[PDB]
Amino acid sequence: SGFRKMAFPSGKVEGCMVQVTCGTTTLNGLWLDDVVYCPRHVICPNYEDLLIRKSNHNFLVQAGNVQLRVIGHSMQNCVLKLKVDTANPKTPKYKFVRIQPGQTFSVLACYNGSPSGVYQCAMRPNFTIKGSFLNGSCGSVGFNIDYDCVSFCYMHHMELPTGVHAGTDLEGNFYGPFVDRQTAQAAGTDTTITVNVLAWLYAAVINGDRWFLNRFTTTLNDFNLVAMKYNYEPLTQDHVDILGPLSAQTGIAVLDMCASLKELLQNGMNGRTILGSALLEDEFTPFDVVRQCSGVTF
Amino acid sequence: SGFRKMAFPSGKVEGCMVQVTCGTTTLNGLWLDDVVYCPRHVICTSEDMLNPNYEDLLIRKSNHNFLVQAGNVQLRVIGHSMQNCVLKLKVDTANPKTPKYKFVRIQPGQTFSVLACYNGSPSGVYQCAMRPNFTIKGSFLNGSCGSVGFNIDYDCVSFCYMHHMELPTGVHAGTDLEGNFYGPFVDRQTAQAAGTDTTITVNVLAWLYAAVINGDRWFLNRFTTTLNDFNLVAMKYNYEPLTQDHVDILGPLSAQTGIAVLDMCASLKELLQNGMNGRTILGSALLEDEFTPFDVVRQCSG
Ligand SMILES: Cn1ncc2cncc(NC(=O)Cc3cccc(Cl)c3)c21
Ligand SMILES: Cn1ncc2cncc(NC(=O)Cc3cccc(Cl)c3)c21
Ligand SMILES: [Cl-]
Numbered sequence: 107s108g109f110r111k112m113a114f115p116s117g118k119v120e121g122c123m124v125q126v127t128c129g130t131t132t133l134n135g136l137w138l139d140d141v142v143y144c145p146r147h148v149i150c151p152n153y154e155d156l157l158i159r160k161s162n163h164n165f166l167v168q169a170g171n172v173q174l175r176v177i178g179h180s181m182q183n184c185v186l187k188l189k190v191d192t193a194n195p196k197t198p199k200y201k202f203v204r205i206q207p208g209q210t211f212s213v214l215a216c217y218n219g220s221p222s223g224v225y226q227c228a229m230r231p232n233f234t235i236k237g238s239f240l241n242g243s244c245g246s247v248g249f250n251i252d253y254d255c256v257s258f259c260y261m262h263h264m265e266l267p268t269g270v271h272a273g274t275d276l277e278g279n280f281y282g283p284f285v286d287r288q289t290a291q292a293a294g295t296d297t298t299i300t301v302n303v304l305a306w307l308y309a310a311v312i313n314g315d316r317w318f319l320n321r322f323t324t325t326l327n328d329f330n331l332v333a334m335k336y337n338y339e340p341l342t343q344d345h346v347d348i349l350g351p352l353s354a355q356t357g358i359a360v361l362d363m364c365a366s367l368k369e370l371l372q373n374g375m376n377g378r379t380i381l382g383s384a385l386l387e388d389e390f391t392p393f394d395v396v397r398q399c400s401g402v403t404f
Numbered sequence: 405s406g407f408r409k410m411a412f413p414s415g416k417v418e419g420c421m422v423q424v425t426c427g428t429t430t431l432n433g434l435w436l437d438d439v440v441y442c443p444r445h446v447i448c449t450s451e452d453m454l455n456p457n458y459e460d461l462l463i464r465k466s467n468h469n470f471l472v473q474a475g476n477v478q479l480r481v482i483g484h485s486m487q488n489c490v491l492k493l494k495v496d497t498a499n500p501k502t503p504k505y506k507f508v509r510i511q512p513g514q515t516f517s518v519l520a521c522y523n524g525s526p527s528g529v530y531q532c533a534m535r536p537n538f539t540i541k542g543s544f545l546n547g548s549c550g551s552v553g554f555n556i557d558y559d560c561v562s563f564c565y566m567h568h569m570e571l572p573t574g575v576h577a578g579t580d581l582e583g584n585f586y587g588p589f590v591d592r593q594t595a596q597a598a599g600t601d602t603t604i605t606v607n608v609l610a611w612l613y614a615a616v617i618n619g620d621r622w623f624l625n626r627f628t629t630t631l632n633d634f635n636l637v638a639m640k641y642n643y644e645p646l647t648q649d650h651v652d653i654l655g656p657l658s659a660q661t662g663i664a665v666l667d668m669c670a671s672l673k674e675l676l677q678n679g680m681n682g683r684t685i686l687g688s689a690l691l692e693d694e695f696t697p698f699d700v701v702r703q704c705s706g
Contacts, residue, residue, distance in 0.1 A: 117415030403525030
């Protein structure tokens with residue numbers, strides 16, 4: 107029993123964190139084999155013009171108390187790839203993956219190439235992440251661990267004026283309509299990840315919380331007309347299919363749980379909590395619920 | 405900016421997790437140097453659990469009865485001893501991944517990271533607090549026994565908790581790494597229940613200071629309170645009494661925000677009376693008590 111916001115064990119990623127310095131700027135890098143990946147703003151804009159004026163020895167890379175000597179450098183979108191002399195012996199089995207809004211991942215927050223904390227979070231529908239980052243956190247990464255393979259999905263780049271965060275996949279493509287420079291940019295209107303709230307309601311039922319259940323059902327169309335009014339993401343048939351296992355485990359049909367969510371949106375919690383929360387939680391995917399309420403290891 | 409419940413990086417602890425088997429029972433062990441630490445109830449059957457005589461059960465065991473697995477490598481047990489509710493298995497190989505460590509016993513209100521494991525394999529990491537009733541509100545399934553709670557300060561891992569059992573309400577009970585339980589609990593399948601839980605007041609105040617640091621001041625008021633008047637109101641909400649030591653501990657945050665501790669107490673009294681009125685503090689609709697004054701300083705400054 108118990109339900110917590112849980113991150114993947116960070117060990118395989120901790121062995122990849124390095125410190126990258128160029129001029130006055132110091133941020134974090136990800137050392138995998140003989141390449142170090144970091145945000146291209148470390149050179150700061152005409153990035154090609156700024157990079158062409160740099161030599162290998164301008165980039166100081168530190169792996170613990172050992173200096174790595176840069177032997178080459180190239181740019182891929184908004185990521186700088188620093189070719190180093192030494193291959194990382196702690197390089198795990200990995201993939202670079204681009205995630206979709208609603209998908210969750212673990213963040214290993216780092217300062218000066220040193221991991222300080224690990225937390226779990228979701229890619230919001232507005233492509234921002236509600237992280238916890240201070241100055242120096244740039245280059246911190248987001249990941250998932252499947253079996254023994256680490257899937258790198260996020261690299262931190264900047265903080266937006268509202269306190270939320272923006273970054274790229276490991277190929278340097280931003281999530282969202284953001285650019286890596288000092289300019290007027292703001293997060294779009296955010297929405298609640300509906301499939302995630304439903305998964306969290308199933309996790310509450312599994313942990314013995316049934317007060318919100320009712321005898322009612324709804325059509326998918328009637329539910330989406332309600333959900334659109336409460337700034338909730340539209341629920342698709344794929345979402346309904348993905349929730350099938352949890353529906354079978356609890357005996358509550360997906361459209362039956364949608365009618366429970368409809369009543370919570372129109373009437374509130376009324377002094378009650380669900381899994382210790384007074385708000386409807388949307389940062390646990392259907393897979394996170396299955397993994398936590400079944401005990402999958404890495 | 406941003407405020408999250410943050411766990412310590414689990415890497416230094418992952419390199420210590422092993423699987424321990426005694427007959428039919430399989431749980432987790434913590435391998436540090438040439439000793440593996442695990443709950444002593446690994447020697448018990450389910451029928452032993454009502455009234456087990458651990459000394460009598462352990463005297464009937466030999467070294468080769470304990471099977472220890474570190475990844476795909478079997479460790480050879482060369483000795484065994486019991487210290488309170490922990491079994492200490494002496495092994496023939498020292499763990500090369502043993503970090504700089506300490507065994508620390510924590511007080512209620514203190515926080516720590518939990519690396520939940522099944523069959524000596526880490527599955528997840530989360531943050532939690534030692535509740536005033538000595539239980540932890542964890543997320544544990546069967547087979548998670550032996551999972552550990554820790555803090556990492558600088559490069560030293562401080563082991564403060566080892567998981568032993570789940571109480572009937574779904575909360576968890578365990579020991580420090582010397583085998584002494586937190587709370588009035590025993591490693592017996594006897595009728596035992598958690599005491600009435602209370603809110604960790606010093607932690608809620610620290611979290612209100614974290615909200616002020618992140619630019620949220622809607623809950624502040626023009627009032628102050630005496631410590632005694634605050635505790636008379638707090639008791640009625642099932643909040644832990646706030647001591648002068650707590651007030652001293654909150655001094656740095658008070659100096660950083662410019663809000664006196666007894667003024668932050670007046671705002672908490674008002675929040676307990678009024679509720680949030682559709683508002684949130686640091687993305688939460690409830691008053692958060694699992695961030696200590698030290699966690700707030702660490703996360704908001706460094
Ligand atoms: C300075 N600072 N405070 C908090 C914080 C959290 N995460 C990141 C940063 N850093 C930045 O935003 C730096 C930056 C500035 C303009 C453009 C880019 Cl691409 C990057 C933070
Ligand atoms: C069986 N089970 N379900 C969930 C869970 C979470 N954590 C731990 C356990 N396991 C136990 O409680 C086992 C036990 C039984 C009686 C006495 C002791 Cl000391 C230990 C869990
Ligand atoms: Cl303590």
